[PDB]
């Protein structure tokens, strides 16, 4: 980060263009009170909710420990401009729900062995609740590829060949029955958010997040891996 | 990555300066004509 919302809005597009400052989340100023602060309990309209990751770890299927990864797709992995609702109770319990905005970004990373691991970084339909110390919830992870995506050989779920057109002699291809079927089914993930600062003067919040989800499976043709994503986040309450 | 950029800049400017100052060194006079 190292820039606030006012500082970011004080620039020009020609000055931000190319500096990778558009892939980062703003931070709060010195006026921010620690933790929940002095926010009046109630339901607010969430806006400008963004999450900037700071580390990716991959646990390959068959391993019990996460591993570091190297990003391959440059600065395209920040979710931003999400909108929703935030409710604060008198005790201190907070509930966050995400409705719209850019809540998904495909990401590809490489691991120690040399295997690229695509995954679909998303917090779509986020539903978390708990104290300001930590909010535990879940989200839905849509398929990496759509239903109309066609593989190299022209096989897709809702459009494409249902078999291998190259091998004409093999009438049924019972050996290839596994790879001829495509399923773009969705899954779910888990999240653990926290709140570190709050400014009731302008209705701004910030904290950290840790999420766990699954990699892609090439439309049901692979065993997905588990990826842990951690970083910071920011949002505005109004 | 900055070290690689510096090294490449040095190499490129070396070769281009060689080209320029070689073609400035009375090149038209190097012919077999009388």
């Amino acid at each position: 980060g190292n820039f606030t919302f006012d500082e970011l809005q004080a620039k020009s597009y020609l000055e931000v263009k190319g500096s990778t400052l558009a892939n980062q989340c703003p931070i709060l100023g010195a006026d921010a009170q620690q933790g929940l602060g002095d926010v009046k309990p109630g339901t607010f309209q969430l806006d400008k909710f963004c999450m900037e990751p700071s580390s990716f770890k991959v646990k390959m299927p068959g391993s019990k420990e996460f591993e570091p990864s190297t990003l391959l797709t440059r600065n395209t992995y920040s979710l931003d401009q999400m909108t929703g609702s935030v409710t604060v109770k008198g005790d201190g319990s907070v509930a966050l729900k995400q409705q719209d905005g850019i809540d998904f970004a495909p990401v590809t990373v490489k691991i120690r062995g040399g295997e690229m691991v695509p995954f679909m970084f998303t917090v779509k339909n986020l539903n978390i609740e708990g104290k300001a110390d930590g909010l535990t919830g879940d989200f839905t992870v849509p398929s990496y590829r759509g239903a109309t995506f066609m593989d190299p050989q022209g096989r897709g779920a809702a459009s494409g060949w249902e078999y291998v057109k190259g091998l004409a002699a093999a009438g049924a291809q019972e050996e290839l029955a596994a790879e001829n079927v495509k399923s773009a089914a969705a899954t779910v993930g888990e999240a653990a958010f926290a709140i570190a600062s709050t400014d009731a003067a302008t209705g701004e919040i910030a904290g950290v997040f840790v999420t766990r989800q699954l990699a892609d499976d090439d439309l049901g043709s692979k065993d997905p891996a588990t990826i842990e994503i951690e970083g910071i986040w920011y949002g505005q309450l109004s | 990555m900055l070290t690689l950029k510096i090294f490449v800049y040095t190499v490129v400017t070396f070769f281009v300066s060689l080209f320029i100052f070689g073609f400035l060194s009375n090149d038209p006079g190097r012919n077999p004509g009388q």
């Binding site: 006012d6 809005q9 004080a10 620039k11 020009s12 597009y13 | -």
Partner: protein, 144 residues
């Protein structure tokens, strides 16, 4: 397939993109210049909305030092202001339209100065230019 009721989309302006691409229609109809001249109510409403937006939003953005937002606002909805002013002033007698043209030219010079100051990122100069622009816009609106 599965039916959906979207009959109210046409009332929301669904045919604007299809009419703008109709090569049979004249260029004035495609660009919307013919409709505004035929119906001056749209021009008057656009002028009033542009004035109100200029006042409130320019004050807010210059106060908070939002230069990009200020310039975009100056050319997002106000983008038809010159054409609307010309169309309104063309329906006036010779002397009245001449005075309106002079006032409009002065106002446009004021807006140009304000945009220059916003680009140069000055606060007090931009505020003074904005006050002058508001005064000139009020004068040209009263002239029409």
């Amino acid at each position: 397939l599965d039916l959906f009721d979207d009959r109210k989309a046409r009332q929301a302006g669904f045919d604007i993109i299809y009419e703008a691409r109709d090569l049979d229609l004249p260029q004035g109809v495609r660009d919307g210049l013919a409709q505004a001249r035929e119906n001056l109510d749209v021009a008057k409403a656009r002028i009033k909305e542009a004035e109100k937006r200029i006042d409130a939003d320019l004050d807010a953005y210059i106060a908070k030092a939002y230069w990009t937002e200020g310039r975009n606002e100056l050319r997002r909805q106000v983008g038809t202001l010159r054409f609307d002013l010309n169309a309104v002033a063309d329906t006036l007698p010779k002397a009245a339209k001449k005075e309106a043209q002079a006032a409009k030219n002065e106002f446009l010079a004021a807006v140009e100065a304000l945009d220059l100051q916003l680009r140069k990122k000055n606060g007090d100069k931009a505020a003074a230019a904005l006050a002058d622009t508001k005064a000139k816009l009020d004068a040209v609106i009263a002239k029409l």
